[PDB]
């Protein structure tokens, strides 16, 4: 799930990497570290739970809170694992990426009609 | 000028290079191919290198764009990210409301105020 | 004791102000650190007991007396280099202020000194690769740390990339014993010494003598060496064979087991070819950084002989020849350091640009050294004469007992060529000491005072002012005597390198 | 002694007796050399990699084919879809011959 | 229909008030896009001026097809109160094609609405598929 | 606040010859950009024509 | 029909093409890729994702990270066709004709009744046996953090 | 000397695809047997005129 | 075919495209090595794998690091 | 460096002032250009600006605006070249 | 004052996780336990007459390496990997349907055809060097020429 | 555990990645049915880059460097974790207290990296004030 989840970051910063726009080639270096910056801590994160269970299975982890939620012992982490997934998806308030007021739509000002939805 | 450009230590006096087969000026014919035979360093302050004026990275915070709340075309002159030189280039909202005034009586010249500040 | 006030000395630099004042402070830390290093190596390691040879970690490292010979040695040359950030080679501020420009100087020694001190150890190859990225590493960083000069960036970039590839040898030989074996404990292999491809041990020491700068692949380290500052070049250029060519050493050790004779006839290519480089290179040179990068080469292609001979007069050969050839290539260096405050200044021709990378750069700024220091112009003289090979110094006894190893073992080729390669080299030689002083009588009598030290303020005019630092003054005195006297305790330095063993016992 | 040859669980390999016994021979005080010891090694390489019984493999194939023997009746069956490891091949009383689901277990 | 941020003068702050709760243009699938690449519609709220011209030429031919454009309030249409200026250009249909014309000083947020209502009644009578069949 | 690029200040001239010093300086300056006038501006003549022009409308 | 071959093809066609850094920074991506997927199947599942999350997650973002600072800036169909063909002929890595064609099987057995995967002997053996091995590693990264700063860090 | 001193000078200059190239070449002498390395002499004394 | 030194072909003209092929050749060794280990059913192998990649990613953050400051010093004018 | 020479430049030198129209179209290193190809103030400029698109050089206003004899400008050309700068990536590979 | 116009959405969302859990819990249960019926696909498909209720077997997950060895052997037993018998005595078909798998041991593709990582000083060795062969076929010759002792 | 079901998911993906990319091309309105005007390529204006409507023609901070490089380091730590997640039952106190030692060298990194403030992008440029002081005579 790690796994996939960067490649998908190698798939955003290309958008912009073929392009000279200026505006959409803005958003590489600073979409760049954004999405390096918050991998470590949401890397980190799902770690802690793997830990804590001492299972890298999906069904394991889950299975391994009948008695108790994660979210009790671990409600900091919860935090940290939802501010951190706003900055791997780009979302606001961790927005600078497709910032409209500050680069428009960011690498998408060069998107259209297909390119745009997929 | 427009198009390119171009001391921390003692001016150190090197004269009479020779080598061990003979002298410099006996083989300053063939020392062009021999690159530790370089009598010009590349880390002396005062190395010669033609480089050219590269522009700063100019962005076009144009017209069509959410800020520009209005028509505006700035200009900005940055140093990596750091702004240096910001240049507003204002008048693509200009109308000439103050010649239009001048042929117009005080009650005509009237709504011509209420669409300087819209708001 | 290194690694622990390794971590002290990482946080606490990091924390007070940066000045040079206190950048030299902790420079002489860490000369404390490496002097306190050799106290407890000594008190707890010795000869009479390392003989057998003990296994530490998990049989991952393995030490016997021929490996701790050489980290007390790496330990001293380590003192030596470091006695020249940690003090004034000059005195002059201009001159002085860049080895105390830079705070991690220190500390990137120290990470080396861990990395030089246990590659001879390794007994696994899989920290045969870890280790040799400790030291290959600290290396590229202490390359590039003077990270504002175009040179030196230059230098680090090139030797990033060579040393990778080296790397990338060293590692693949290393998979394919793996491959054939499936173990990974150097000792566990020796059980298959006769039952593995032998030329995939050779794969591996292609790839350490790449490191060592070996031609074919000299090529690098003369580049290198010509353009990093010349306090960097005093330790990149002598501390890596300190540790390759005893682990070198080890793993011929364990090859000639099988006696295999096409793996001794492409080494020998490789000597006899270096030779004739590190020979006929240095004839036609001006730089002097480039004139001792060909006199290293040729060095270690003398020390190969008596690796690649490997018999119990090998061990002797390598041994004197490994100690000797440090404190002469330190003393050198030294000189060089100091010497450059006699250059002159102009008030014109052949636009030569000096910085304070390389003060000293050609061979011809050595000129008249005779006359405006006598003293340290014989000490270099001793130091090259006894590179030369000019008995009784030191540098003779090193050819005399590697031609010894050579030839008890059959090697009339090479101990022949080395004996030509030798007085070739000569000549290049006699060139550093025909500019120190064959114009001495013509410019005796001179109007000198636009020397750089004369540069230096004047302090009270009534009181006596030397000229030169009192530690590098001691140190340079101290090592041109120890060239030039070996001869009187000859003997029981040679007989206290009998007793060095590796697996010869009884 | 470090550990050499360690299975995906944990515990000795398939090889790691063998490689024991070397260990044994050749670290033994009783032997005055490594002759002894010398058929443990080969052991251990053809526990490895076969070489020796892959050839006697090869000449199998070969001799049969300079005698003209059949290759489907001296060799052993096989199937090579694993789909198709039906119960008709696998001699069941009832089995049909319908492919068997190997999509989730 | 995603329309594209064209706001010049004060025919944009009615344009807004379109997307504010009251009338919520985003209600209906109108959402303003900052990019031609994105957009649809080309909204000309506000003067057109001499300098701004070529500008609006350039957004204009950056929009793919298919593409409309509205022409707000009296200075876009037809230069308005500054139809005898020496730096503004009387109609905007001078520079672009126009498809609809809505008119007031500015228009109301309702009369934008309707220009809108008015476009989309076109938009959804045409044939662009069917002519093929038939005129082709 | 700096002033842009390629500016210069404005100063009330007294002298006639020193006038045509600055105005002959500004002319190799209009045909120095000339090259980049056309790449700039992807102008469809070549640079030739556009020295040309300039060098008319100083002699007007 | 083994297409892993043919992924190989267009990739070593575009590796005697590629003129700009992009397509250079193309061929490393193009070349984990098939080093994943053939781990996935056949050897090791285990390795095949510890390079994504490690090469492609962490090493290869990097690459493209510096390639937007570093810059962008500025043969013949017979000879390349001719090439790789010539490289497509001989592809047997190794002489051993019977250990290249003859098959081998392993016998299961039941005496592990402790079963865990490979990631649980690993972090077994190297955080007991070679922790020697783990605590250089660090030790390694950490003059990393320290080479790096003092590498690029200006003043 | 001169006109092998002349040769060996041309040699060092920094430069990846000469030092890379030269490494390549040499795990050629880990492929060749043995008894070929006299004219591998051969052919390099030859290629220094 | 690669005796002839074809792999000189295929290595980009930029500095960049060496670091690259070094990352390209050690992966060679990596693949190598897991793929013994899994058939000798050898966890050390893995173990082996393991610092290889780990060693070797922080091989490319150092040559990067050179790089970049290469880069850097000769755009190092900064008078403005 | 300049691996440029004085004898080699003044080719270029002759070849590109041969584009004006001059009264002697014949040119050497003494050529002048108020007498020997009579030019004024346009004309000149024009040539110098011509030499500069050939020579990679750029003259200043102080020596631009003083000229009378062409070998100054060999003379300024051979003092004033300098080689192109190379990429980072150019440099060493 | 809950507004149901915004909650309309979500109740769509619950219906799409709500659509794929369905399906994957019953389809894939239904195939497990149909498959776990008998060794014939007129067993599997009719439901018997005499035949009790129908026990449904849930899909298995979190294995090791002893359920590939109970998969293999229950297939040897009843045709499938999770069928289903408790008879104490296995038939006579049980002792001569052992599967084995033979599959080869080559090197990865990638790494004896890629243009670059095939290139290494002992690839080549291995590859054009014909030392290590000449010296192992050796010990090959040898079994055969010690079958006369 | 098989994967014969996830191998289908996989390739059905695969084959939806050519469907998106091909149902733009089948449905979109041939160019000569909207305007004519040209295709894509022809039309320059139409395919260029967006820069607000005026037309115009990277020197990062040194911070943005140190954090992309301070990545790789701290990426293999966290990565080098993940053996001791699945055994850390197995391995006890004595591969707990090497874990943690395992940290602790690493953390003296990021001390060293905190006291150097090598990530802060810093303001060395601009931000300059000064004291007027008179110079009386
Ligand atoms: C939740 C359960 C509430 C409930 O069951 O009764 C109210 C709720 C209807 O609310 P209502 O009719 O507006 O209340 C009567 C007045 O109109 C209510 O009008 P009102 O504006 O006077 O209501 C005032 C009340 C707010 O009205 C409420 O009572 C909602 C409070 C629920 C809070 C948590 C949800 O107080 C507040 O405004 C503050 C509440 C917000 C504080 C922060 C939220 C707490 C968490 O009854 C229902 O459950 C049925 C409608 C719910 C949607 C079902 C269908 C969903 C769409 C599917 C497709 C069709
Ligand atoms: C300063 C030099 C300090 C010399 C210290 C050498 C030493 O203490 O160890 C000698 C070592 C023998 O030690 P070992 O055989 O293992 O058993 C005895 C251990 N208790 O013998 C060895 O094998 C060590 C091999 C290296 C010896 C290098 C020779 C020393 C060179 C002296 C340099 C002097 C420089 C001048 C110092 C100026 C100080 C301001
Ligand atoms: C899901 C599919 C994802 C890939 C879609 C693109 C497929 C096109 C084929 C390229 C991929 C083949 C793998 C070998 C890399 C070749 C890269 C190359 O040489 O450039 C290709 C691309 C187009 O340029 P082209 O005309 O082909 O070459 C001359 C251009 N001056 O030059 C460009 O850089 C244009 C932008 C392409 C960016 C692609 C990034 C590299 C590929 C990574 C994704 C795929 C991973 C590899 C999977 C297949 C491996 C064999
Ligand atoms: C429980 C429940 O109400 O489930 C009923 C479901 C969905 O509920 P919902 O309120 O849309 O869940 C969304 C809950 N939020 C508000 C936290 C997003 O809708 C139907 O099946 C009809
Ligand atoms: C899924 C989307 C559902 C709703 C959109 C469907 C509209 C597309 C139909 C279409 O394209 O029909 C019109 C077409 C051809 O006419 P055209 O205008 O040149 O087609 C434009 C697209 N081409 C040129 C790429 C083909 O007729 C047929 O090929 C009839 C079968
Ligand atoms: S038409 Fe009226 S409201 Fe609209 S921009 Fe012009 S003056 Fe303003």
Known sequence: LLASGSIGVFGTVIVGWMSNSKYTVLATVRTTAQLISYELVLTTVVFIIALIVSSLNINVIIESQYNIWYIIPFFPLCLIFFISALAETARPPFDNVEAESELVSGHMTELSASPFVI | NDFYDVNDFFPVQVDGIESSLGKYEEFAKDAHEWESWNLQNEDHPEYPVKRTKIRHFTLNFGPQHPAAHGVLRLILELHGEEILRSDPHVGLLHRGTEKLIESKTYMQALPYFDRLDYV | ?506 | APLQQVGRHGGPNKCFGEFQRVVECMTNAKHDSYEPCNNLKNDYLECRKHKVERYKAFLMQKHAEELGKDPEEIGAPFVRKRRFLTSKTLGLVDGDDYEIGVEKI | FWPMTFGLACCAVEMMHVSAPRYDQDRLGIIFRASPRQSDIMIVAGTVTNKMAPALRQVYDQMPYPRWVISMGSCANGGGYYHYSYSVVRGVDRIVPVDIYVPGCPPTSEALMYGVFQLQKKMMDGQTHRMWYRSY | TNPTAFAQTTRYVKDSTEMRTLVLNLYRRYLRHSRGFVNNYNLDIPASQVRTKIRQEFER | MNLEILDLSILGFYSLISSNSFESIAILVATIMPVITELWYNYSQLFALLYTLIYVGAVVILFVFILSVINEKESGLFILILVLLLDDLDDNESNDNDYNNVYITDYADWFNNYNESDLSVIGNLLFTEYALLLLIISFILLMSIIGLILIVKKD | ?49 | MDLILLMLVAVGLNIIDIYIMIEILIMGCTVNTIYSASLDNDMIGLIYSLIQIIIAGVESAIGLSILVNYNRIRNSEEIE | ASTLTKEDVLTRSVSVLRGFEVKTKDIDLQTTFVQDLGMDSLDLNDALVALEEEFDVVFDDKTANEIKTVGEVVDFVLANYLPTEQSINHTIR | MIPFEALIPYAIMFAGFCLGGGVMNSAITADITKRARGPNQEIKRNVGEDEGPRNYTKPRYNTDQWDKYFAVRDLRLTGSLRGQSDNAVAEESFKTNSIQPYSNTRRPWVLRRHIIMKNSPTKWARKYSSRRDEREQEIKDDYIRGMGE | ?137
């Open chain 8, 1 to 49: 000397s001169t006109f092998i001193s002349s040769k060996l000078n041309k040699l060092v200059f920094l430069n990846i695809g000469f030092i890379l190239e030269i490494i390549v070449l040499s795990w050629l002498l880990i492929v060749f047997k043995v008894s070929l390395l006299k004219y591998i002499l051969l052919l390099i004394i030859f290629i220094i005129l």
């Open chain 12, 1 to 137: 555990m098989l994967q014969d079901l996830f191998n289908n998911y996989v390739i059905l993906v695969g084959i939806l990645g050519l469907i998106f990319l091909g149902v733009n091309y089948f449905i979109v309105e041939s160019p000569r049915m909207d305007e004519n005007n040209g295709n894509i390529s022809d039309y320059i204006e139409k395919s260029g880059p967006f820069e607000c409507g005026f037309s115009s023609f990277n020197p990062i901070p040194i911070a943005f460097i140190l954090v992309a490089l301070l990545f790789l380091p701290f990426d293999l730590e966290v990565s080098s974790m993940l053996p001791y997640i699945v055994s850390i039952y197995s391995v006890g106190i004595y591969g707990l207290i090497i874990f943690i030692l395992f940290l602790l060298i690493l953390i003296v990194g990021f001390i060293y990296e905190f006291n150097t403030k090598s990530l802060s992008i810093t303001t060395i440029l601009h931000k300059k004030n000064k004291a007027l002081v008179k110079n009386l005579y």
């Open chain 3, 1 to 506: 004791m290194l690694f622990t006030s390794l971590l002290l000395i990482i946080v606490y630099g990091s924390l007070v102000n940066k000045s040079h004042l206190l950048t030299k402070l902790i420079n002489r830390l860490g000369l404390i650190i490496i002097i306190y290093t050799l106290l407890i190596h000594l008190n707890i390691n010795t000869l009479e007991n390392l003989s057998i040879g003990i296994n530490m970690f998990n049989n991952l490292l393995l030490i016997n007396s021929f490996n701790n010979t050489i980290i007390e040695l790496i330990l001293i040359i380590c003192i030596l280099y470091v006695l020249l950030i940690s003090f004034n080679i000059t005195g002059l501020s201009i001159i002085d202020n860049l080895n105390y420009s830079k705070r991690t100087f220190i500390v990137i020694v120290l990470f080396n000194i861990i990395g030089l001190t246990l590659l001879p150890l390794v007994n696994d190859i899989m920290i045969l690769f870890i280790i040799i990225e400790l030291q290959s590493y600290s290396l590229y960083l202490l390359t590039a740390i003077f990270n504002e000069s175009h040179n030196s960036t230059k230098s680090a970039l090139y030797y990033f990339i060579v040393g990778s590839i080296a790397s990338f040898i060293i590692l693949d030989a290393t998979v394919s014993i793996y491959d054939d074996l499936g173990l990974t404990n150097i000792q566990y292999i020796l059980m298959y010494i006769d039952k593995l491809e032998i030329f995939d041990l050779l794969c591996l020491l292609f790839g350490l003598f790449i490191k060592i700068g070996l031609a074919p692949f000299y090529s690098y380290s003369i580049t290198i060496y010509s353009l990093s500052p010349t306090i960097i070049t005093n330790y990149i250029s002598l501390m890596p064979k300190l540790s390759i060519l005893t682990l070198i050493y080890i793993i011929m050790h364990y090859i000639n087991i099988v006696n295999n004779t096409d793996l001794n006839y492409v080494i020998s290519f490789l000597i006899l070819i270096s030779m004739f480089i590190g020979s006929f290179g240095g004839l036609n040179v001006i730089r002097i950084k480039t004139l001792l990068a060909y006199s290293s080469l040729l060095n270690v292609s003398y020390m190969l002989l008596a690796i690649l001979s490997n018999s119990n007069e090998s061990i002797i050969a390598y041994i004197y020849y490994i100690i000797q050839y440090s404190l002469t290539h330190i003393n050198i260096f030294s000189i060089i350091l100091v010497i450059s405050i006699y250059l002159p200044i102009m008030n014109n021709m052949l636009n030569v640009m000096i910085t304070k990378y390389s003060p000293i750069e050609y061979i011809n700024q050595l000129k008249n050294l005779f006359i405006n220091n006598i003293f340290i112009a014989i000490a270099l003289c001793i130091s090259i004469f006894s590179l030369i090979g000019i008995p009784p110094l030191t540098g003779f006894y090193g050819k005399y007992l590697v031609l010894i190893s050579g030839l008890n073992n059959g090697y009339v080729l090479l101990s022949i060529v080395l004996i030509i390669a030798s007085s070739i080299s000569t000549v290049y030689y006699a060139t550093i000491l025909k500019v120190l002083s064959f114009d001495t009588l013509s410019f005796k009598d001179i109007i000198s005072n636009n020397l750089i030290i004369n540069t230096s303020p004047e302090n009270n005019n009534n009181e006596i002012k030397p000229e030169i630092s009192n530690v590098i003054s001691y140190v340079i005195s101290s090592l041109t005597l120890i060239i030039l006297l070996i001869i009187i305790q000859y003997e029981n330095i040679v007989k206290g390198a009998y007793l060095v063993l590796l697996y010869n016992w009884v």
